[PDB]
Amino acid sequence: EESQAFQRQLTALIGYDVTDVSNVHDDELEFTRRGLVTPRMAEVASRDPKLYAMHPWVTSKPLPEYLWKKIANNCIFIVIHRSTTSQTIKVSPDDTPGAILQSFFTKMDFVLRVCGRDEYLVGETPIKNFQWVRHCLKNGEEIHVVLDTPPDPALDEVRKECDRKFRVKIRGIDIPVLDLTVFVEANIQHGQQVLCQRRTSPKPFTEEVLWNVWLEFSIKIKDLPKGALLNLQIYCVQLLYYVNLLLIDHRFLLRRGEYVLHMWQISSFNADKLTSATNPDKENSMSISILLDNEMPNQLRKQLEAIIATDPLNPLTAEDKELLWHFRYESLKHPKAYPKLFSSVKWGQQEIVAKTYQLLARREVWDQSALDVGLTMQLLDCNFSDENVRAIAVQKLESLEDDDVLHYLLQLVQAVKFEPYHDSALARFLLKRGLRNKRIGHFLFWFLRSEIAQSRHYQQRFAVILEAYLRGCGTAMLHDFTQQVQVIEMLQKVTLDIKSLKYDVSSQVISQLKQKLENLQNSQLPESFRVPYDPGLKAGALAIEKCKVMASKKKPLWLEFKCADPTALSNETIGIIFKHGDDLRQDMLILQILRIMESIWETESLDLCLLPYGCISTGDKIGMIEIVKDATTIAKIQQSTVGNAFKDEVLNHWLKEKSPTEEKFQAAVERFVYSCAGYCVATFVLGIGDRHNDNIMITETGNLFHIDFGHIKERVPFVLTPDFLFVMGTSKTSPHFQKFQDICVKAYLALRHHTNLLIILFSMMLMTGMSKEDIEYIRDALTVGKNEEDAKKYFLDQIEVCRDKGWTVQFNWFLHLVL
């Protein structure tokens, strides 16, 4: 009654009913639900109530060199507010909020909260190590803080509670609505690698096809490893339908009995092809019926080290694998060899896997090695099905601080798609970290909710994990999630309703939007809600006056909100775009990679001023986008002076008229040089550089930024046009262009220092977000095998290609958009 009503609340928060049993052939999901109770309760019990409530956002990384240059006399200023009075206090970079509050007690307990945000500066951390402080220093802003009472931890209340050979009988296949022939392929898969394959005889493709054939495999029963899949595929030759079945279940028991599995349709490698889930659509999908009733020389060391040295994508030959295995104990001494070593394992052999587990018992070097995320990511991809192998990776992730978890959270959530079982160390890890920290927990919610909303292949698994999180996140957050979900669902209806009503925005359309938003305001739209892409901000009532439908292809919503926090230092509005038509999952993955690149450059004291805008995918081809204020499209700047032909002088003239002083114009040029170089390198490595200038924007303060990363003859490495080069002062070279080339090289080489990581993140992105030939682009782009000097020239060539191409590519883009 009360418990059943709480389940409906969770179902409304999740967007999927976890109690549903219409689409299962076992109890794995229910076993996982029950299995996650312990790790949930264990973290909820162990977390510090006060620190969990205030969720301080901190880093233990050293402050970069450019930020130390912006602080003089070893002194940082903080303006402390209280009701109607505010005072400035000189604070040393090492001062703890506990010690600073004592200064505002002697010079004439409470807590320091950031003005206009749900962000607190508390706990035993020096203020230099608070993220907000670092953010303020980055943009050159004074830190405004308020002295108020700490939030009550009671608000985070949690509600109480055998030598036989393997064989499979193929009975037949049937489709309600389809003179070609058809056959069934049966594979024993372990980590993408096919252990054994058997086919059936081709029969005429009809509404029902029956075989009643025993398919005897070469691999024995005992030789079957845990996490092995029975891949069943239907070829007409082209593949049409696929479905999977774990041969050994979540209880270590061999699979037996009759199975009627509804299969998936086909639109090379894809994460969706690994799924243990069956198609929920019974009425329309193809289904299959089955029956189960059962020390080393100098030369070799040099060869071994060459194998270990190679990139993650370089494939191992039989020779390479046999060498790695034979010398596994020397291979075990190199953490970088681990992925390649565990790919040399014959997993279809009981005695070998046993030796592999005996090998993992001697993890002295691995355990003691400094954490390499790139390496750790490798062991979590589709190439590895073994629980123990994968577990040693998740162990390495344990030492990541909350700051670093946020950097890899999205990819780590997507990495769950590669897990053979619903319950896994990785899932438990994501559960643990999300429950420990409110910020990780906030983004965990949305990332998991995103896939539930649009992935039939993985919604069931992710729903079990989200229910797990929500059952321990506390009433306070549960309330915050409820206000958020209601808002986006309301505004998605408005987004789709307006799009229905040529690319010209008429009078009658703009009126209808204002009408609907006025009707929602007075109705059931909550007074305030957290911004999904920025949980620090609380948005309030809609500023309908400033709301509009933009003159675009997909006709998105331009929505603006008042800040719910009265302590806000400015009367700025929170701007959000709601859009249907772009695949914002792809945008999410690119932007997250962009934020990883910003962290990579920070290690080498660089700030290339990227603007990776906030973006949350909320469903199928729909979601929200942060509005970057005071920004315009490069094409629109060309339109205002020219019309439809391009002039180099336009961009520099635009920056001048948007500048009040020369002092701020010089800052606008320097910001452009850095930000252009930033996107030039990033887009080239990712293979998303060749772009029309409609999808490239700039702010009034000079900051260039790319948008709309969905779905990506003369070609170009990146967009460096004569109007960009005119801002630098070149038509020839300039002190700004010399600075530009100096930044590009230093940035490109800095990324190349993390080659493996970027390759894995890329590889994973294509498998979870969007062939082998598509992945191999990044190897060439990062010039794997070449030295720094040789690589420095390579990118300097790419820059010279853009100057030799000029407007040609952009001109061709312009013609392409006119049919």
Ligand X SMILES: Cc1nc(Nc2cnccn2)cc(-c2c(Nc3cc[nH]n3)nc3cccnn23)n1
707 annotated among ligand-binding-site residues: yes
Whether residue 287 contacts residue 295, with contact meaning beta carbons closer than 8 Å, is answered with no
User: Rounded distance, CA 233 to CA 243, Å?
Assistant: 7
The least distance separating ligand X from the CB of residue 491, rounded to whole angstroms, comes to 16
How distant is the alpha carbon of residue 521 from its chain centre? 33
224 annotated among ligand-binding-site residues: no
Nearer to ligand X, 541 or 628 (CB): 628
x-marked contacts with ligand X along 502-541 as a string, rule CB under 6 A: ----------------------------------------
706 is written with which tokens? 């790319």
575 annotated among ligand-binding-site residues: yes
The residue range among 202-210, 624-632, 682-690, 762-770 that interacts with ligand X, by the rule CB under 6 A, is: 624-632
678 annotated among ligand-binding-site residues: no
The least distance separating ligand X from the CB of residue 611, rounded to whole angstroms, comes to 7
- 700 is an interface residue for ligand X by CB under 6 A: no
Local structure of residue 656 (DSSP, 8 states): H
Nearer to ligand X, 648 or 700 (CB): 700
User: Rounded distance, CA 83 to CA 150, Å?
Assistant: 16
The least distance separating ligand X from the CB of residue 560, rounded to whole angstroms, comes to 11
The least distance separating ligand X from the CB of residue 272, rounded to whole angstroms, comes to 24
The residue range among 472-480, 619-627, 771-779, 787-795 that interacts with ligand X, by the rule CB under 6 A, is: 619-627
Q: SS3 letters for 266-327?
A: CCCCCHHHCCCCCCCCCCCCCEEEEEECCCCCHHHHHHHHHHHHCCCCCCCCHHHHHHHHHC
The residue range among 14-22, 48-56, 278-286, 574-582 that interacts with ligand X, by the rule CB under 6 A, is: 574-582
Whether residue 723 contacts residue 729, with contact meaning beta carbons closer than 8 Å, is answered with no
The least distance separating ligand X from the CB of residue 452, rounded to whole angstroms, comes to 22
576 annotated among ligand-binding-site residues: yes
- 550 is an interface residue for ligand X by CB under 6 A: yes
For 107, residues 6+ apart whose C-beta sits below 8 A from its C-beta are 89
User: Rounded distance, CA 776 to CA 758, Å?
Assistant: 12
- 402 is an interface residue for ligand X by CB under 6 A: no
The count of residues in the chain is 819
Residues 654-683 that bind ligand X (CB under 6 A): none
Give the H or E element holding residue 482: helix 475-500
User: Rounded distance, CA 101 to CA 609, Å?
Assistant: 33
Nearer to ligand X, 339 or 556 (CB): 556
- 56 is an interface residue for ligand X by CB under 6 A: no
Phi and psi at residue 389, to the nearest 5°:
-55, -50
User: Rounded distance, CA 490 to CA 520, Å?
Assistant: 8
The residue range among 24-32, 49-57, 628-636, 762-770 that interacts with ligand X, by the rule CB under 6 A, is: 628-636
- 10 is an interface residue for ligand X by CB under 6 A: no
- 707 is an interface residue for ligand X by CB under 6 A: yes
The residue from 339, 556, 678, 702 that contacts ligand X (CB under 6 A) is: 556
The residue range among 151-159, 408-416, 454-462, 549-557 that interacts with ligand X, by the rule CB under 6 A, is: 549-557
- 589 is an interface residue for ligand X by CB under 6 A: no
Give the H or E element holding residue 439: helix 438-454
The residue from 28, 156, 565, 587 that contacts ligand X (CB under 6 A) is: 587
- 560 is an interface residue for ligand X by CB under 6 A: no
User: Rounded distance, CA 44 to CA 306, Å?
Assistant: 47
- 53 is an interface residue for ligand X by CB under 6 A: no
Phi and psi at residue 659, to the nearest 5°:
-95, 135
User: Rounded distance, CA 788 to CA 794, Å?
Assistant: 10
The residue range among 186-194, 575-583, 671-679, 763-771 that interacts with ligand X, by the rule CB under 6 A, is: 575-583
The least distance separating ligand X from the CB of residue 453, rounded to whole angstroms, comes to 18
Nearer to ligand X, 633 or 812 (CB): 633
For 614, residues 6+ apart whose C-beta sits below 8 A from its C-beta are 531, 532, 533, 534, 624, 625, 626
Residue where the block lists tokens 């000079």: 702
Total number of residues that touch ligand X (CB under 6 A): 16
- 339 is an interface residue for ligand X by CB under 6 A: no
The least distance separating ligand X from the CB of residue 582, rounded to whole angstroms, comes to 5
513 is written with which tokens? 């939007």
Closest by Cα among 410, 495, 490 to 451: 410
User: Rounded distance, CA 503 to CA 556, Å?
Assistant: 12
Whether residue 78 contacts residue 136, with contact meaning beta carbons closer than 8 Å, is answered with no
The residue range among 21-29, 177-185, 414-422, 622-630 that interacts with ligand X, by the rule CB under 6 A, is: 622-630
The residue range among 316-324, 576-584, 678-686, 762-770 that interacts with ligand X, by the rule CB under 6 A, is: 576-584
The residue from 681, 708, 751, 798 that contacts ligand X (CB under 6 A) is: 708
- 552 is an interface residue for ligand X by CB under 6 A: yes
- 397 is an interface residue for ligand X by CB under 6 A: no
Whether residue 251 contacts residue 26, with contact meaning beta carbons closer than 8 Å, is answered with no
Phi and psi at residue 396, to the nearest 5°:
-70, -30
- 146 is an interface residue for ligand X by CB under 6 A: no
Residues 57-76 that bind ligand X (CB under 6 A): none
- 574 is an interface residue for ligand X by CB under 6 A: no
As separate numbers, helices (DSSP H) first and strands (DSSP E) second, the chain gives 32, 24
How distant is the alpha carbon of residue 188 from its chain centre? 31
687 is written with which tokens? 């293979």
The least distance separating ligand X from the CB of residue 786, rounded to whole angstroms, comes to 34
- Could you list the residues known to form a binding site, using ranges: 575-584, 610-618, 705-712
Contacts to ligand X by CB under 6 A: 550, 552, 556, 577, 579, 582, 587, 613, 625-628, 631-632, 707-708
Binding site, annotated residues for ATP = 575-584, 610-618, 705-712
